[PDB]
Write a protein that binds this ligand. Structure first.
Ligand code: CA
Ligand code: CA
Ligand code: ZN
Ligand code: ZN
Length: 250
């Protein structure tokens, strides 16, 4: 595979932006603002991404920082209403709120199920179809100005923000309408590939350090038509829902 080196000749703005980019991908900590904290903080990011090169930021580490992925952080903390991190219910329901002109309501609705279903089929849980009433996980499009925190940011950084399984209103699925969504066009963020990563967030799941994980933050490569849930991904949830067998953090 390729591996250029443009960061070496990048401007201070590009290098400085990387520092803030990793901050938004985690939480709002303006106290960590420091030169030394960069090494320690950056190190923690390496484990989250899975990349070997630690304390690095110019080669692959910087590339992922500028490359799109998800609009959700890697660390949260807001009371403990819902039991356990992942879904603890006996059934999961989902319903699309709106569709993007990029794809038909049928293609978008079916896409979510194509990925959301794969998640359930890999767990002893259970999913239910929506045909009358409201669902737990709402699949709608909107920008950061739709009435939520964090700015839309527009195209690029930040793909979509997902909510955790908490309360009735929480645990919904959102997508950056400003981004590029499509399937048969395979030009932007494949709804199928994005759905798996986005839908997985609603299940409380977390990014994997495996190079072949479905929740991999480095999303972007040969995507086969048989693309499905990853090994470490299924084994990870099975350890919390069923039996464990040597796993890692989220
Ligand atoms: Ca964006
Ligand atoms: Ca909800
Ligand atoms: Zn994510
Ligand atoms: Zn939102």
């Amino acid at each position: 595979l390729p591996l250029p080196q443009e960061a070496g000749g990048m401007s201070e703005l590009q290098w400085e932006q990387a520092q803030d980019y990793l901050k938004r991908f985690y939480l709002y900590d303006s106290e960590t603002k420091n030169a030394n904290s960069l090494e320690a903080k950056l190190k923690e990011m390496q484990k989250f991404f899975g990349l070997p090169i630690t304390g690095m930021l110019n080669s692959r580490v910087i590339e992922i920082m500028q490359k799109p992925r998800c609009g959700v952080p890697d660390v949260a903390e807001y009371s403990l209403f819902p039991n356990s991190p992942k879904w603890t219910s006996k059934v999961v329901t989902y319903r699309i709120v709106s569709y993007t002109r990029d794809l038909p309501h049928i293609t978008v609705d079916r896409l979510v199920s194509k990925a959301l279903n794969m998640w359930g089929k890999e767990i002893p849980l259970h999913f239910r179809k929506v045909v009358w009433g409201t669902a737990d996980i709402m699949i709608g499009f909107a920008r950061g100005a739709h009435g939520d925190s964090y700015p839309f940011d527009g195209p690029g950084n930040t793909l979509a923000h997902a909510f955790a399984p908490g309360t009735g209103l929480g645990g919904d699925a959102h997508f950056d309408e400003d981004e590029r969504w499509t399937d048969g066009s395979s030009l932007g963020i494949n709804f199928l590939y994005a759905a798996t990563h986005a839908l997985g967030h609603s299940l409380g799941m977390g990014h994997s350090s495996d190079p072949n994980a479905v929740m991999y933050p480095t999303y972007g490569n040969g995507d086969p038509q048989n693309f499905k849930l990853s090994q470490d991904d299924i084994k990870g949830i099975q350890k919390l829902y069923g039996k464990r067998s040597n796993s890692r953090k989220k």
